[PDB]
Design a protein around this nucleic acid. Sequence first.
RNA 1: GGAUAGUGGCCUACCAUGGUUUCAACGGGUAACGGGGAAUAAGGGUUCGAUUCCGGAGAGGGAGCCUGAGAAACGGCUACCACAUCCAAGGAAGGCAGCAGGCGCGCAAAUUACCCAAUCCUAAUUCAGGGAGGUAGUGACAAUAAAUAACGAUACAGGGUCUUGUAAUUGGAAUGAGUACAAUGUAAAUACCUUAACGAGGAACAAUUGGAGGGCAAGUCUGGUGCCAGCAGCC
Lengths: 121, 59, 177, 185, 23, 47, 134
Amino acid sequence: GKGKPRGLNSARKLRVHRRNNRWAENNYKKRLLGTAFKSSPFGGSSHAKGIVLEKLIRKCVRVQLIKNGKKVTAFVPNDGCLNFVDENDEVLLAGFVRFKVVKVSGVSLLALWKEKKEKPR
Amino acid sequence: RRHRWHKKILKTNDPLVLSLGWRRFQTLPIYTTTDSRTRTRMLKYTPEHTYCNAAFYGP
Amino acid sequence: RTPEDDPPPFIVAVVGPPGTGKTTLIRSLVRRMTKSTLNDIQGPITVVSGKHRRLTFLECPADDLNAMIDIAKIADLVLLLIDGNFGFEMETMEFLNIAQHHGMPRVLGVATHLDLFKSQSTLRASKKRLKHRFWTEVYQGAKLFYLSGVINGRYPDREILNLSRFISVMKFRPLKW
Amino acid sequence: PRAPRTYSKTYSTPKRPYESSRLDAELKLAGEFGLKNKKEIYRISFQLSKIRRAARDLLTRDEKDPKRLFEGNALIRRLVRVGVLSEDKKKLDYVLALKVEDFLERRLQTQVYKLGLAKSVHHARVLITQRHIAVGKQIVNIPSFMVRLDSEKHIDFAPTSPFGGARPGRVARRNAARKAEASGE
Amino acid sequence: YDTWYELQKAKISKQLEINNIEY
Amino acid sequence: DGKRAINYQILKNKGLTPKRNKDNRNSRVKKRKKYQKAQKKLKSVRA
Amino acid sequence: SDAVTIRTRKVISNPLLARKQFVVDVLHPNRANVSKDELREKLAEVYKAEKDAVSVFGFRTQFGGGKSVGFGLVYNSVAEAKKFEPTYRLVRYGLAEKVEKASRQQRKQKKNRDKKIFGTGKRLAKKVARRNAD
RNA sequence: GGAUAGUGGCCUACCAUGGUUUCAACGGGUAACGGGGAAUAAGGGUUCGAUUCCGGAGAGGGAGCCUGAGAAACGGCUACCACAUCCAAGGAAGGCAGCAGGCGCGCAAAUUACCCAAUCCUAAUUCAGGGAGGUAGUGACAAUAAAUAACGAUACAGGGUCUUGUAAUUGGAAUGAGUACAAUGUAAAUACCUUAACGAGGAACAAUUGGAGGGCAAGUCUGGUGCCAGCAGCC
Ligand SMILES: Nc1nc2c(ncn2[C@@H]2O[C@H](COP(=O)(O)OP(=O)(O)OP(=O)(O)O)[C@@H](O)[C@H]2O)c(=O)[nH]1
Ligand SMILES: [Mg+2]
């Protein structure tokens, strides 16, 4: 009836056929080869360290990543905290302009916006 | 900015003993805000929780 | 921009409130690293540790803010000492803010006057509170030393040994300035 | 290098948290029974779901099965002894039709409020929390005690707990001292 | 090399050691 | 004494947090008055 | 502190160590606690016990106060009360003096220092004395 | 036949040409120690399992050996490779994937603590030893229960003669977070349980983290800013 065999002694054909066919699935291949994280902007990471290269539209900045060397745009929440990053600052970025600024100079931006901490220079 | 643990705000044309570089000296800064990137509005006081620009004479 | 042949001695500045006992701390450190008790300490004093290291200790004038700011600008290692029974004071906070703004050196906390506590519960709770306030001001997980007594004009040998051991293996950061 | 001690989670955060019907239903539950937060409702729902799963698994089994008889009799006896099931409702079809309000009614807060001497569920909560309740002769201060059916008549004040006599508390002593040293002379 | 930070640190180190060896 | 003691503002370190009510500390009282406003509304509409 | 009630349950006679083992529970409705020396004195006057041969060692006060349950035991002819008891409980009752030693680090370091010599070491002592003296 | 504690191509001399495989031999990869188990499911499956128990292997990498019933042992020995300590320059000594602890980035994370009291192990052995193990200390791993208030009187707003809210209004009760004689606890302690005394009106004994048209909840709320060859012209 259907394409698949239906014998009692035909488990080998079904198992071999499934093993052959699972390779044509994108998730299976990218999870067995370990290359599924190159489509992400960060690579395999969840946060990326970067250098504050220029102050850009008005809220965002232009930050060069330290790992691969390419330069992206970064979102700085609470627009006044735009002035905390100055030049060549060491920042830690998370995805949101698809990026955002989380940890500037080791400390977090929420500890500076609420004046909990101060930036080590 | 006014430091978050300093009780009172600063005032324009008042002495401030500031350390910069290797030097430590007393100046008479003037605190200005911007008129939305058009001119330099002269501020008579220091804002409580935001940043203001300041011009002062020194090395 | 540091020399490889003969590096200069690292500067260890001790900073705290006036009556909290920094002279006893530098005295005990010098005695443990030289087996020679020295009295009437004034100015920077140079000691040699290991086969390559040298440390020049300097005591901060507690009341003045001027030389205090200069010390925070200059020092590479800062032993910041806090009275355990009293708590944090304004001089500690001011020095921490000056050091943070001018380029943060390696800060190492030490707490004294811990024999004045009459109960272990208060002592443990106060140690936890001071450690967490230090972890707020300095990086989290930073370890600080607890000093018991001054029984012979100097601190117990084990804590001084751990102070000497930690600063005999530590490395420093290239500051921009 | 020792034996692991067993532990389990007692609650479960719902997948559909802030839908309006369950939201104001649990608001009514926490308001009428004086619950502190929503973890009480989730914990009672977790217990009810465990009991429902046990009752369903037992009801799929055949009649006069010794497994079904033993575990059903044990579960029904336990819920009768707690006070949830009525004395004329000893069937599995009736424990599949239970509700969380039966378990919320049985707790010590309501069971001291419903017997008087508390006048509100929150005064009862404060009275329990402030170390006053004597179940049997043992001091209880836990508001989720789930009073047993046989122990429902022994709830009273402590030999401690100055509402049952025995040397009134600290602020009464403060008031007596103030009225003696200032109003007295 | 492998990382941009590593190659910039290597550049700083190699100009430092050329300066040292001409010293 | 001459020892400059610590300040409450710089010790607990809660800066720029919004000022919340006394009733936000305890969830029981907040849910009490929430249910009380709800039953007041129910009594007002079911007359 | 009106009165204390002392009840000894689960009494098992143990002629293996020549004693009697029981779980004491005390009703002390007001005072604070058991006062284990006072409780030991009254438990001594209970049977016929000659107080130094009585040992009560486990105690826990029930939540809410008033009731305290512990485990204790009574010997006879106090000689084997000294023979069969642990040392720390003998010291706790005043029947022995706490011996003073060094800490474990000092003892282990002394053992490792004495591990490095062969014989009494008087020969090495005389040898190093004549070597470093002249 | 040798060797083995012993079987055996384990090895040796001789003689045959055999042995495995499309039911996948063989080679390669594995960020592959295996199992008990863990999670998600209604079931089938899918994924994880270095890690409290059982088995195996290793003690920086090869190789060999002594002793002994038992080791190819590394807190035993010998040599080679790579690191690396001491000095008088001839020589000696080394192995934290044991417990602490340090380095490995200039961006960071438990105590170089106490004790054999418990559980057991070892010996010539009731007695000594045990960083095995236990105790306490330490970043909210995970998990359980639970404080931060309860009852009133007065004036307005109500539902409208009995039921509630608001208040820089007020009255007395109750209590633990802490402090602390004592006692318990414990090898000695800390802590818990108990408790003489102190300890609450701004309960200052001062709860947080987010979000608001939606989705699967809660704004047809307010002010300010950049620009306009749009109307008026400095509102
Ligand atoms: N109880 C107690 N006393 C201490 C401790 N440390 C230091 N002291 C005492 O505090 C006193 C004051 O410290 P000083 O020796 O004068 O050192 P200092 O901090 O430089 O003070 P000044 O010399 O006046 O600037 C000493 O004499 C010590 O006896 C401690 O840890 N516990
Ligand atoms: Mg001094």
